[PDB]
C-alpha cells in the first residue's frame, strides 16, 4: 500500500500577526513538499530530490492553492472562536490532513479529509466518503453546513482521482529512493546492574524504513516475558534507531539471543553477547 497525504496547520496569535500557516506533503511518510507562511514571499518548496523535476507551473499552482487554503483557515480560526465562545486573546490551533492510501492494484484503500481544533478531533469525512462524523455540537454546525452544501462530493473527487493519479506519478518520480531499505547495523551491549544481574540491550542503528521487530529469546523460545524497549527514533540523516533489553542472571548470557527483523534484511539476524 502507498500514500500521498498533506498535513496542514494554522496557529493564531491575535494582536501579534496573521496566523502561522504550514502545509507538508508526504508520500509514504517521506516529506517532499512544504509551504511555510513565514517568509516575505512564501511559496511551496521541494523537500525531496525527486520532486525537483516538477516544472515551474506546478510550483506556482501549488503555491496559489496553499495561499487560497491559508485564507480559508484564517476565517476558520475566527469562526471557531464564536462557535466556542472564546476570547480573541488566546492562541488556537486548527489542523487538517487529507490524502489517499492506494493498494498495489491502484484501488483506493482509504481516503482522509479530517480536522482538529486545539489538539483534538473536530470533524472527519467518513470512509463512505459521503458523510461526516463531528466531535461535538459546534462541529455539528459545520457538518450540517457541509452536508447541505454537499462538500463531500468535491472532497471525494480529489481523493479518488487527483490524489490517486499523482501518488502514482510521485512513485515513479522517486522510484530510486522511496522504496529504499537500509538494513539495521545491530550489536549487543552488556550492562551489569546493582541488583546483581545483567541488562542485555539489543541495538539496531541506521536502518530505513522505521518499521522493525526486535525480540529476545531464551534458549530459542518465546521470551516475550516482559522485555524493555524504546520508541523507534530518528537521526539527522533520516535513518532510524531502536533497542530492546531484558535482565538476565550473571553467568548465563549466552543463553539469550536477539532476533532482528527488517524489510532490508533478506534473512533475520540473530545476535548473542558473544
Amino acid at each position: 500500500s502507498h500514500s500521498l497525504r498533506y498535513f496542514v496547520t494554522a496557529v493564531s496569535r491575535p494582536g501579534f500577526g496573521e496566523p502561522r500557516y504550514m502545509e507538508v506533503g508526504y508520500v509514504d511518510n517521506t516529506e517532499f513538499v512544504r509551504f511555510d507562511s513565514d517568509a516575505e514571499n512564501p511559496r511551496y518548496e521541494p523537500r525531496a530530490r525527486w520532486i525537483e523535476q516538477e516544472g515551474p507551473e506546478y510550483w506556482e499552482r501549488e503555491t496559489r492553492r496553499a495561499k487560497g487554503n491559508e485564507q480559508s483557515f484564517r476565517v476558520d480560526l475566527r469562526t471557531a472562536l464564536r462557535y466556542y465562545n472564546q476570547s480573541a486573546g488566546g492562541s488556537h490551533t486548527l489542523q487538517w490532513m487529507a490524502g489517499c492510501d492506494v493498494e498495489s492494484d491502484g484501488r483506493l484503500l482509504r481516503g482522509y479529509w479530517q480536522f482538529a481544533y486545539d489538539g483534538c478531533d473536530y470533524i472527519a469525512l467518513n470512509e463512505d466518503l459521503k458523510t461526516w462524523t463531528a466531535a461535538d455540537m459546534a462541529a455539528q454546525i459545520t457538518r450540517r453546513k457541509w452536508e447541505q452544501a454537499g462538500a463531500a462530493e468535491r472532497d471525494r473527487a480529489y481523493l479518488e482521482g487527483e490524489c490517486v493519479e499523482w501518488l502514482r506519478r510521485y512513485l515513479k518520480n522517486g522510484n530510486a529512493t522511496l522504496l529504499r531499505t537500509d538494513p539495521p547495523k545491530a550489536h549487543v551491549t552488556h550492562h551489569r546492574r546493582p541488583e546483581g544481574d545483567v541488562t542485555l540491550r539489543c541495538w539496531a542503528l541506521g536502518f530505513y524504513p522505521a518499521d522493525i521487530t526486535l525480540t529476545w529469546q531464551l534458549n530459542g523460545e518465546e521470551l516475550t516475558q516482559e522485555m524493555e524497549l524504546v520508541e523507534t527514533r530518528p537521526a539527522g540523516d533520516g535513518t532510524f534507531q531502536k533497542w530492546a533489553s531484558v535482565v538476565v542472571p550473571l553467568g548465563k548470557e549466552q543463553k539469550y539471543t536477539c532476533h532482528v527483523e527488517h524489510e532490508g534484511l533478506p534473512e533475520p539476524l540473530t545476535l548473542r553477547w558473544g
Binding site: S1, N29, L109, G119, C120, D121, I123, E127, A135, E231
Partner: protein, 121 residues
C-alpha cells in the same frame, strides 16, 4: 491512575487517564481483571465516540507480525466489519479510538486506555 468510567447495557467501560504504550494498557487492564476494549459492532463504535474524552485511546485491536493480520484481544471476530487492509503497518500496529475516527497508531507511543468488562459473561 485517575479513572473515568461507567456501564451502559451489558458492558462497563474504564478510561485509564494515564498515557501508556499499547502493551502498558493491555497489562493495566488484565491486572484489574478487565481486557483492553473490544468493540463489538457499529452501534457501539458510534456510542463510544460520543463519550471518548477528547483524545486518542488504545483499544484491544492490534497487528500480529507473524500472522500478518489484525486481531482483537480475545483472538475472536467482531460484528464490527473492518477491512484490515485499510491500515498499513507503516502507521503503526495498534488501534486508536478518537471522537471522530478509528485509526492505527504507533504501539510504542503513549495514549490513555479503554478497558472493558462484559456483565453478561
Amino acid at each position: 491512575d485517575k479513572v473515568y468510567w461507567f456501564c451502559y447495557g451489558m458492558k462497563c467501560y474504564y478510561f485509564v487517564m494515564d498515557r501508556k504504550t499499547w502493551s502498558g494498557c493491555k497489562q493495566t487492564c488484565q491486572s484489574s481483571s478487565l481486557s483492553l476494549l473490544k468493540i463489538d459492532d457499529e452501534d457501539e463504535l458510534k456510542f463510544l465516540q460520543l463519550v471518548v474524552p477528547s483524545d486518542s485511546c488504545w483499544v484491544g485491536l492490534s497487528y500480529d507480525n507473524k500472522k500478518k493480520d489484525w486481531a482483537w484481544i480475545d483472538n475472536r471476530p467482531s460484528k464490527l466489519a473492518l477491512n484490515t487492509r485499510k491500515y498499513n503497518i507503516r502507521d503503526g500496529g495498534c488501534m486508536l479510538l478518537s471522537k471522530t475516527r478509528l485509526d492505527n497508531g504507533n504501539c510504542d507511543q503513549v495514549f490513555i486506555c479503554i478497558c472493558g468488562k462484559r456483565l453478561d459473561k
